[PDB]
Design a protein around this nucleic acid. Structure first.
Ligand code: GTP
Ligand code: MG
Lengths: 51, 51, 157, 249, 146, 115, 55, 85, 81, 297, 154
RNA sequence: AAAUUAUAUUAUAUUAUA
């Protein structure tokens, strides 16, 4: 349902590992990807006529 | 704070989502005017693979 | 394979509630989602989009995509947890490519496990040593698995 | 039917478990075998619990919170029908069932007799005027599951059609807390129940008092008396990658 | 095989493919006063340079003896380049500038930036990318205790 | 001089439409709304959803959204139970007539949003 | 991150003042006058059969 | 004919600010509501100029292509010249 | 020279923003107003749309002192200048 | 057999097969017709299908006799390089360039081992130059199949024609349906070396083409790319990490510099600094600091 | 039933002239048999309708041969005798479908469409929420809400 | 008075009256 998106630092985990959000941030740093803030999580609709 | 994609039909239906009213637009398919005025600059094949 | 309706009925003469014939905007069609696009009477910017074929086809494509999304998300009995490479089981100690990057990868062809790694779902009760090291009280009980070699009612004993 | 003599045999049959769950593809002989074993159990004068469809409990019409059980819920119509039909099915043995752990100060209208039997208890439960039956069924299901858990000498076969609906979440969801919090107006109260819908966490089956008593008999190992010969259902709608809208005709 | 060769231990040699299109008209736009802008249109329309490299060619030893791309380096490169990696081949289609020389310069720069970001998995385990397991909900045996 | 007072009158009619009470937007013929008022859904509206329906003045969209958010009878309620049509739920509270749909003043331009 | 708050609103007002000050800026969409014929004076409509798109 | 591509392009109470007006209120006024550069004076203004407070306050001349607005009021403020005619 | 999308024009966007901030004074840019800043002078600037929150419109939202109403019908019979 | 599958695997198969269409490595170090060093594709286009088919017989016969002459010129050089030669000292210095080898420390290759790595590569040139020459002597006019890669060099590959139809009035009376069309044959030339003599000869086919028949050229060649670990270093993450606010709209021009980042190669020595103290501050070895500053003692 | 709109009546000859499209559609004829099989009722006029139209669709693509001429009208009248015999059995199933469905809809508390008669509950044509505010052929004003044909407690 | 040329399918329309 309605929730808050979480983030765990690798310094807080018992085994450290690179997360996926900072990997996304590194990819956006490399390829200059615009990160939309107001993109809703409920609206993930595929173009099912083509896909 | 974000929302997950819904699982019931009544939450998708009763959510205030506007419908398409004016002419729809695509960021690359607007140079081509419409599917009937589909504009092609060069007559390359449709199975032309770029090297 | 699915037998639900996808396309919109075309534009023609105004249909009547007869045999093999439904009106063009009925509450039975598309769960009543044509109520947004109907005119009850038997301002041009609010009247022209209800009669355009591409507009109503895009709207029913959006509604069918919403139905496909809610049925794909109601299938989910799991969730994705970012687990480090060391504590993961042996089938996930490989280089897993991204989606639509390579051939759909089998899980383990050497150990006779021919199944997609992206559809693999692991039990929560078998990863309590990985997901919950701080509790130390065994918050979930161990899964009772049946003895397949035990003489039971299935084997006429 | 005589379990105390063949207890080791029945333990070897179930592999020590409380009963059997029957699974297979859809349209097999699952519910037919459930009706067959209800016939087998009730033809041999055994007290038998039969839930002929589990989707009247979990996927029911409406959900109501339990009156005496805090944090629990009830399906009132399915419980009224169950308390009617189980009583009229097993009246032969429930009238000889003396109430062991049952309070005798039950609320009782003028002209009605206080229940001294388990059949009398279910008759107190399901036979009532609305809306007093809505809390009477909650009290009756609680004390019926309490009275079932204490009997260790009479064999009670429990047959449920579709146990896979009692093992996951019932389709009811929790109410929004703004319903119980109270509002003065809708304009300035910081609420959105009238503006936008949202999906709250879904209620599991273990929060129903009927399935609470069932899981209390299952998990507690002090009941070598209840044999759960149940099955699953695969009655669900199809989905094969895409789905349009279902044609209503 | 053209290209520079690095002999220092901080310079790795990547054997890579470059694909590009040459197109000159010879029928109508071979010569007249239109020929300049038509040839410029053919050149800027063919501005794409496809830079391709196998990941197996990146799994060699560096100048310091350590392997260039290891398993965790390969995982971080696959995650940082999501759709640009396909069938064991990292491919970058540079279309940014009108000329193909500036496009291959930009593609070499982006390949080096992606490699330098992916090489962080050799620093420690905190740069190893996390495995995404589809962990199930608690089962009915666990939900019975609720 | 007439367009300004006409726009003011139409805006006043729209706000008095938004303030006033409506009839029940659900059909009392179809289940689960067909049941008696002493059992079922009308029990749960009486003790839990009474102030929420009284505050929203029984317009069909907030009543359907409160029935969505009450959770104890969804999601089958808003799909299986038939609701009154949009022009039929527009009618004010205590109408008891089908002529009242056409009795309202049509000189205003609220696009069907007047009593 | 560098430009936030009052600097962003001031920059948006300044670029709006720059955008309105350009007399003759072509903001006309392409499909309004994309039906002009070069050989004859007959005016067709793009989207119908009165116009061919390639030649 | 294609959808809403005609080259030659109403009272409503609940759709007053949303019918033939800009979608957002965050956006600024259009180009005809401001003076671009050095002008000798225009004979008429365009139909997309928003009626502001200073139209009814000052009231020098309002010429719309004709149309003469000599009755100033505050019920026109915030709306373009299309629905005012 | 960059080609295609605006994301490929990094230096040109910087030079354009620097030139726009260079030539434009702030005393000119003060005069440009948004739509709600003009609509605030309307006697009834704000009301809900009938798509989401139409039931939240209250009787205090009307500028009832700026018109004259009829006592029998309840309609507005005159408007104040 | 019979084939019955899950639908989710079929949904994943069909998207992966179309997205990986041009994710192909053409010039691989391998055997015959698959493996090569450079790949030339000459896309011929004309208005008639027999026009492009007769051109693709004219160009393939031309590039067969030219390409056999060039590969014979390379085969006569490779067989001289295999009879004997002197090892280049720059080639020997390229093998002894790394600090640590596979066996730990410096791997000192002599002139025997470096000439062995050169001989094993030139043995691959002979097996790949004979593969092109043998496929250039096969298509006699008695039996010719230039559409098969195993038979002829170069081979011709089919391409789908570009067809565009028009719907216009013949008057509101009737609708005419005329289609513009042009047909394509591509010619795949796979050479196991880069030859500018062949690229010059391939580019001048445009001067003797057929009537109303043009062409375009594709080239997929191998090129060495250097990843400099000093211009693009592998460093730790910063202490204050980046967020989504650094990746807003127009953060591509106002927040981020272009790659690479400029790092200072000059420094100034402070008051009490020595050779061991500057190298500690710069994070380098002391002997490495003196080699960059061999002018100053 | 969720079809509550006002409807248009059709003659029974136009229904049966559809043939395999709507009248003898095999999916529709199967679920008509499940209505009769649930009530413990033999499906004899429905089986009579299916066996006729099974053979009628089998030769429906063949062209009839030209008749060179007969002295008496006996083979032409026999071909017309069996033709009007097949219409009357299909007229009986057309009435048997509309008879039992309105009888089942009175049992399942199902509200029919506009101007539709259910023999037990609504002898007149039941109308609910029509676009016309009055009864179309009884000439009576409609109350709000719609008329309830059944009791309340489900 | 035969052979069948026959297309056939279903829906709509007006100053109710502004
Ligand atoms: N009389 C009888 N009928 C049977 C028997 N086995 C199967 N059937 C038939 O098979 C059908 C399937 O019965 P169910 O047991 O309800 O099917 P299911 O396996 O539960 O299918 P789901 O409900 O989708 O899980 C029934 O309608 C019966 O008519 C049997 O042993 N005796
Ligand atoms: Mg079953």
């Amino acid at each position: 349902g309605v929730h808050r998106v979480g983030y765990t630092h690798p310094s807080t985990l018992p085994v450290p590992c690179a997360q996926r959000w900072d990997l996304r941030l590194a990819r956006a740093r490399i390829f200059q990807e615009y990160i939309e803030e107001k993109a809703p999580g409920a609206w993930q609709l595929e173009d099912e006529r083509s896909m | 704070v974000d929302q997950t994609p819904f699982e019931e039909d009544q939450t998708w239906l009763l959510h205030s989502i506007p419908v398409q009213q004016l002419e729809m637009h695509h960021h690359e398919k607007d140079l081509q005017d419409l599917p009937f005025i589909n504009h092609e600059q060069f007559p390359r094949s449709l199975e032309w693979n770029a090297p | 394979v699915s037998t639900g309706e996808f396309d919109h009925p075309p534009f023609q003469f105004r249909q009547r509630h007869t045999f093999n014939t439904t009106p063009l905007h009925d509450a039975n069609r598309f769960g009543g989602r044509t109520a947004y696009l109907r005119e009850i009477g038997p301002k041009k910017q609010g009247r022209r989009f209800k009669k355009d074929p591409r507009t109503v086809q895009f709207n029913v494509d959006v509604w069918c995509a919403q139905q496909t999304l809610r049925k794909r998300w109601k299938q989910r009995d799991w969730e994705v947890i970012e687990i480090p490479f060391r504590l993961v089981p042996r089938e996930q100690q490989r280089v897993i490519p991204e989606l639509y990057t390579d051939i759909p990868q089998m899980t383990d062809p050497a150990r006779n496990d021919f199944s997609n790694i992206r559809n693999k779902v692991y039990d929560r009760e078998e990863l309590q040593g990985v997901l919950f090291p701080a509790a130390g009280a065994m918050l979930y009980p161990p899964l009772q698995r049946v003895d397949k070699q035990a003489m039971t009612l299935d084997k006429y004993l | 039917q005589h379990w105390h003599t063949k207890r080791s045999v029945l333990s070897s049959l179930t592999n020590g478990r409380t009963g059997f769950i029957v699974d297979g593809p859809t349209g097999c002989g699952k519910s037919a075998l459930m009706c067959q074993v209800v016939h087998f159990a009730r033809s041999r004068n055994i007290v038998t619990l039969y839930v002929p469809d589990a989707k009247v409990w979990t996927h029911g019409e409406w959900c109501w919170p339990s009156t005496i059980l805090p944090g629990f819920f009830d399906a009132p119509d399915a419980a009224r029908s169950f308390l009617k039909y189980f009583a009229v099915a097993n009246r032969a043995t429930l009238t000889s069932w003396k109430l062991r752990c049952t309070p005798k100060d039950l609320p009782t209208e003028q002209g009605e007799r206080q229940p001294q039997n388990l059949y009398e208890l279910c008759e107190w439960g399901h036979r009532a005027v609305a809306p007093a039956s809505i809390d009477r069924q909650s009290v009756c299901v609680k004390f019926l599951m309490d009275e079932l858990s204490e009997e260790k000498k009479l064999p009670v076969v429990i047959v449920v059609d579709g146990w896979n609906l009692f093992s996951h979440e019932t389709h009811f969801r929790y109410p929004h807390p703004d319903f119980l919090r109270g509002l003065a107006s809708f304009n300035e109260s910081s609420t959105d129940i009238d503006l936008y819908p949202q999906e709250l966490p879904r209620i599991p089956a273990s929060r129903l008092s009927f399935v609470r008593g069932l899981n209390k008999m299952i998990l507690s190992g002090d009941d070598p008396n209840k044999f759960f010969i149940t099955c699953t259902t695969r009655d669900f709608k199809p989905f094969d990658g895409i789905s349009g809208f279902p044609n209503v005709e | 095989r053209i290209g520079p060769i690095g002999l220092e231990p901080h310079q790795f040699n990547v054997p890579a493919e470059l694909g590009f299109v040459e197109q000159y008209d010879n029928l109508q736009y071979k010569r007249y006063d239109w020929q300049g802008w038509y040839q410029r249109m053919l050149d800027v329309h063919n501005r794409n340079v496809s830079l391709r490299c196998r990941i197996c060619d990146l799994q060699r030893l560096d100048g310091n003896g350590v392997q260039f791309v290891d398993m965790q380096t390969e995982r971080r490169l696959r995650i940082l380049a999501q759709h640009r990696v396909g069938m064991g081949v990292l491919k970058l289609d540079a279309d940014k500038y009108e000329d193909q020389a500036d496009n291959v310069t930009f593609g070499t720069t982006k390949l080096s930036e992606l490699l330098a970001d992916a090489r962080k998995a050799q620093l420690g385990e905190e740069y190893w990318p996390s495995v995404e397991l589809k962990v199930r909900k608690p089962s009915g045996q666990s939900k019975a205790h609720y | 001089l007439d367009r300004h007072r006409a726009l003011a009158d139409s805006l006043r009619a729209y706000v008095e439409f938004s303030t006033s009470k409506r009839v029940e937007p659900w059909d009392a013929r179809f289940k689960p709304f067909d049941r008696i008022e002493k059992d079922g859904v009308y029990v749960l509206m009486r003790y839990m959803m009474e102030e929420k329906l009284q505050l929203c003045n029984y317009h069909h969209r907030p009543v359907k959204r409160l029935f969505c958010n009450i959770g104890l009878m969804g999601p089958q309620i808003t799909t299986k139970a038939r609701w009154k049509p949009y022009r039929f739920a527009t009618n004010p509270a205590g109408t008891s007539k089908a002529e009242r749909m056409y009795q309202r003043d049509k000189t205003v331009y609220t696009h069907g949003h007047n009593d | 991150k560098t430009v936030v708050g009052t600097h962003q609103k001031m920059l948006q007002r300044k670029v709006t003042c720059f955008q309105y000050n350009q007399y003759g800026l072509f903001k006309t969409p392409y499909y309004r006058l994309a039906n002009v014929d070069r050989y004859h004076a007959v005016q067709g409509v793009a989207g119908t059969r009165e116009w061919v798109p390639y030649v | 004919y294609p959808f809403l591509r005609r080259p030659h392009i109403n009272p409503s109470a609940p759709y007053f600010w949303s019918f033939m007006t800009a979608k957002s209120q965050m956006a600024f006024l259009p180009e005809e509501n401001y003076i671009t550069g050095d002008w000798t004076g225009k004979f008429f203004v365009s139909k997309r100029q928003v009626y502001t407070l200073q139209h009814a306050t000052s009231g020098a001349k309002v010429r719309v292509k004709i149309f003469e607005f000599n009755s100033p009021s505050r019920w026109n403020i915030g709306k373009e010249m299309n629905t005012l005619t | 020279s960059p080609h295609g999308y605006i994301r490929h024009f990094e230096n040109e966007v910087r030079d354009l923003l620097q030139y726009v901030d260079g030539v434009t004074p702030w005393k000119q840019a003060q005069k440009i107003r948004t739509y709600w800043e003009v609509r605030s002078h309307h006697p009834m600037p704000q009301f809900n749309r009938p798509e989401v929150a139409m039931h939240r419109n209250t009787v205090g939202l009307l500028p009832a002192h700026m018109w004259e109403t009829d006592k029998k019908t309840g309609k507005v019979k005159s408007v104040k200048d | 057999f019979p084939f019955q599958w899950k639908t989710e695997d079929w949904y994943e198969y069909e998207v992966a097969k179309v997205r990986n269409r041009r994710f192909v490595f053409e010039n691989t170090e391998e055997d015959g017709i698959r493996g090569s060093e450079v790949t030339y594709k000459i896309v011929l286009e004309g208005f008639w299908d027999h026009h492009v088919m007769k051109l693709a017989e004219d160009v393939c016969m031309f590039l067969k006799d030219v390409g056999r002459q060039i590969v014979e010129e390379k085969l006569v050089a490779v067989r001289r390089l295999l009879q004997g030669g002197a090892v280049d000292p720059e080639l020997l210095a390229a093998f002894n360039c790394a600090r640590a080898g596979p066996f730990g420390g410096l791997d000192e290759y002599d002139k025997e081992e470096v000439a062995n790595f050169l001989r094993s590569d030139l043995r691959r040139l002979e097996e790949q130059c004979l593969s092109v020459i043998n496929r250039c002597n096969v298509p006699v006019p008695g039996a010719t199949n230039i559409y098969d890669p195993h038979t002829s060099w170069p081979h011709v590959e089919k391409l789908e024609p570009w067809v565009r139809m028009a719907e216009f009035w013949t008057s509101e009376m009737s609708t005419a349906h005329y289609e513009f069309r042009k047909f394509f044959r591509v010619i795949i030339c796979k050479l196991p070396f880069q030859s500018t003599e062949f690229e010059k000869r391939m580019y001048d086919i445009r001067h003797w083409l057929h009537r109303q028949t043009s062409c375009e050229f594709h080239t997929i060649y191998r090129r060495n790319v250097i990843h400099d670990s000093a211009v693009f270093p592998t460093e730790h993450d910063p202490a204050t990490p980046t967020t989504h606010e650094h990746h807003r709209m127009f953060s591509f021009a106002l927040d981020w510099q272009s790659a690479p980042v400029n790092r200072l190669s000059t420094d100034t020595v402070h008051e009490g600094e020595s050779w061991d103290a500057v190298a500690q501050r710069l994070g380098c070895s002391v002997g490495e600091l003196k080699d960059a500053n061999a002018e100053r003692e | 039933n969720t079809f509550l709109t006002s409807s248009v009546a059709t003659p029974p000859i136009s229904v049966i002239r559809t043939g395999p499209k709507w009248w003898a559609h095999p999916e529709r004829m199967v679920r008509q048999k499940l209505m009769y099989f649930t009530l413990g009722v033999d499906q004899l006029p429905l089986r009579r309708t299916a066996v006729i139209q099974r053979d009628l669709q089998r030769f429906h693509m063949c062209k009839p041969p030209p008749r060179v001429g007969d002295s008496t009208g006996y083979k032409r009248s026999r071909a017309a005798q069996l033709n009007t015999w097949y219409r009357r059995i299909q007229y009986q199933e057309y009435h048997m479908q509309h008879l039992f469905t309105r009888h089942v809809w009175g049992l399942l508390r199902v509200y029919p469409g506009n101007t539709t008669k259910i023999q037990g509950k609504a002898d007149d044509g039941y109308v609910g929420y029509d676009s016309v505010p009055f009864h179309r052929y009884n000439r009576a004003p409609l109350p709000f809400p719609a008329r309830e044909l059944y009791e309340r407690r489900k």
